[PDB]
Structure formats: C-alpha cells, structure tokens
Amino acid sequence: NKITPNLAEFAFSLYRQLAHQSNSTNIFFSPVSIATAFAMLSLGTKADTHDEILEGLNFNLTEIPEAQIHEGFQELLRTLNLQLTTGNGLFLSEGLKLVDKFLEDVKKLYHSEAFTVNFGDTEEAKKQINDYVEKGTQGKIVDLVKELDRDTVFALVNYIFFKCKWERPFEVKDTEEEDFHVDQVTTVKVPMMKRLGMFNIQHCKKLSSWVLLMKYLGNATAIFFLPDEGKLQHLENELTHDIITKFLENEDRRSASLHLPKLSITGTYDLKSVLGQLGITKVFSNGADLSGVTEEAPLKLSKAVHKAVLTIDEKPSIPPEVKFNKPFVFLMIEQNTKSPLFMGKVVNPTQ
C-alpha cells in the first residue's frame, strides 16, 4: 500500500514518543485507528490546519497526492470489515450549522458517526460520549472520557477493541502461573500459556532479540520481540518497517518450547498532547480552520481521546525454551496491507 511505509514510521515515531514517558508502563495503541481518525478529520480542515495533520501522520505533502492518502485508508478500512471492534465518534455542540458534505464523507469513507450534544452540561455530555464508547463495544470500555473543558464545542473519540483467536490454539491445561521479571529485582506472577511445536520464531542478531510471528484467525499477524538482557531500548531504536517486511516474507519454521503470557491490556491516550509532539497543534487551538465541518462558526477540537483494548488467551535435538516472561515489544500487522494494526510494550501483564 502506498501509505503502509508512512503508517509504519508514524507507528514507530508514536511509539518512541510514548516510550519517552519512561519504562514501567504498559504501552498499547492502534496506529491505524489513530491515523484513520485524523485523516478523516482532515476532510473538514483547510490551509495550515489540514497540512499539519497529514504531515504529523508522516505524509510528505510534496511527494504523495492527498487522493492517494485517503484512498490508502479506503482500502485499509475496506479490509477491516477478524473479531475487531473500532469506531470514531464526532461530538459537536448542538446548534451548529454542520456542513452536510463533511457528514456524508465521514460515514461513506470512514464509517464514523457524528453526534450533536449539549456541552453546556459538561458532566452529562461526558456521560453521553462514554455511553457511545460503552455501547459501541458492548461494555468493553467504560468511562473513557474522564474530563471535559468548559469551552468544549467539539470532541473526537477513537476506540478499538481486539480479542481474536489464534489459528493454532494453546491447550488450557498447560496454562500455569509463572514468574514475570518486570525488571531485575521486582518480579510478578502471571498466567502463562505454553506449547511445544514448530513456530515462525527466530533470533535476530541485529535486533539482539527473539522474534516470534504467529498468525491470527483472520487477516492479522502478531510479531513478538523478546529483547536480550539490557537490549530493550536497543530493540526500540532499531525497529524499522523494512525489518518487519523481512520477517513477514521469511518462512523458516523451527521447533521451540514457547511460554507466552495470557494477558489483557488497555491503552488510553489524550491525542491532543501526544499528537502535539508530532506537530499537530493548530486543529486543537482557537485558530483552527474547520470550515469544512461548520461554515460560519469558529470551531476547534477541544478533546481527542484514543482507547485500545487487547485480550490474549489460548483461543525431531533439544528445542529452545523461549519464555516471554520479561518486558517485550509486540506488533499486530494487518495481513493484507502489511499496516500495523496495534503496537505496544508489555512491562507487566497483571496491570
């Protein structure tokens, strides 16, 4: 896909930014869902506001036409509907003369929903937004938005929930509690899945990590990066889209004793500050050019929140014993487009 190299580097730049909030916190987000949410938002923006959004998503505006950018997200969204739940909620103040052109493209191209709410009642508007998140995933995510500004007129919520089955399941009788070294001294107890068999697992000398690829029931592939002792940040700095491609084409099977933790992690992020570090600020300020959304009315994106939820469960010489019992990076790749559906780091499964 013409945007997959751009999405992959946006994913890594976003991950590197979140990893600079230090080590001991579980990172998990969907680069596809965030990039799709703001590419869709760009349809209502113009001038510098429009350019910052696409530049912040790692699109060189002097090298790729915007029609290809929105076409790139067109096919990527055409693929996603796998056991994946995703949606975008645009919440605008009641009494705003919305531009019908933007509302049609939001549903037609990105399958996103726009709502009218009374932000003059901050507590109730927050409840209305969280109910859409709660109902949209059938209770999976509750009370997403925790605060709202007093001057809010426009809020964007992007959610994604993933709990899918492996193609090759683990046997539940094997799952047992093991040690998870969060660092060299702390340790914690975690339910660990285990299986002996042939895996697409290899040890990479460049990354200094074990790399495991496992295929999903659907168009998804999970890549697990288990770093060597003291090589976690080395893993984070040497990750490129090219290395992901070299692993997805490699088809070397090999036997191992895999210990993979059963875990359920969630990620919550305020995109206003996180995407501000990538240069997307004008849309969050009073000078925003949102004339594509409402024509004769000033508008700005007061609140933008992302929430991603994951659930991992079961569903001839001496083989190596590869145990994911210490902090490790992982990456979910959409099989068709080779785009990163999810990326994150697991420092503590219990959290």
Curated annotation (Swiss-Prot):
GO terms of biological process kind: acute-phase response; blood coagulation
Matches recorded under SMART domains: SERPIN
Result of changing residue 320 to T: In L-Offenbach
Outcome recorded upon mutating residue 87 to S: In QO-Newport
Effect noted on mutating residue 120 to W: In M2-Obernburg
Alphabetic keyword roster: Acute phase, Blood coagulation, Endoplasmic reticulum, Extracellular matrix, Glycoprotein, Hemostasis, Phosphoprotein, Protease inhibitor, Secreted, Serine protease inhibitor, Signal
Segments passing through the bilayer: none
Pfam family membership, one: Serpin
Effect in UniProt of substituting residue 313 to N: In P-St.Albans/P-Donauwoerth
Tissue expression per record: Ubiquitous. Expressed in leukocytes and plasma.
Top-rank lineage group of the source organism: Eukaryota
Modified how: N-glycosylated. Differential glycosylation produces a number of isoforms. N-linked glycan at Asn-60 is alternatively di-antennary, tri-antennary or tetra-antennary. The glycan at Asn-23 is di-antennary with trace amounts of tri-antennary. Glycan at Asn-219 is exclusively di-antennary. Structure of glycans at Asn-23 and Asn-219 is Hex5HexNAc4. The structure of the antennae is Neu5Ac(alpha1-6)Gal(beta1-4)GlcNAc attached to the core structure Man(alpha1-6)[Man(alpha1-3)]Man(beta1-4)GlcNAc(beta1-4)GlcNAc. Some antennae are fucosylated, which forms a Lewis-X determinant. (Microbial infection) Proteolytically processed by Staphylococcus aureus seryl, cysteinyl, and metallo-proteases.
UniProt remark on domains: The reactive center loop (RCL) extends out from the body of the protein and directs binding to the target protease. The protease cleaves the serpin at the reactive site within the RCL, establishing a covalent linkage between the carboxyl group of the serpin reactive site and the serine hydroxyl of the protease. The resulting inactive serpin-protease complex is highly stable.
Name this polypeptide is given: Alpha-1-antitrypsin
Organism: Homo sapiens
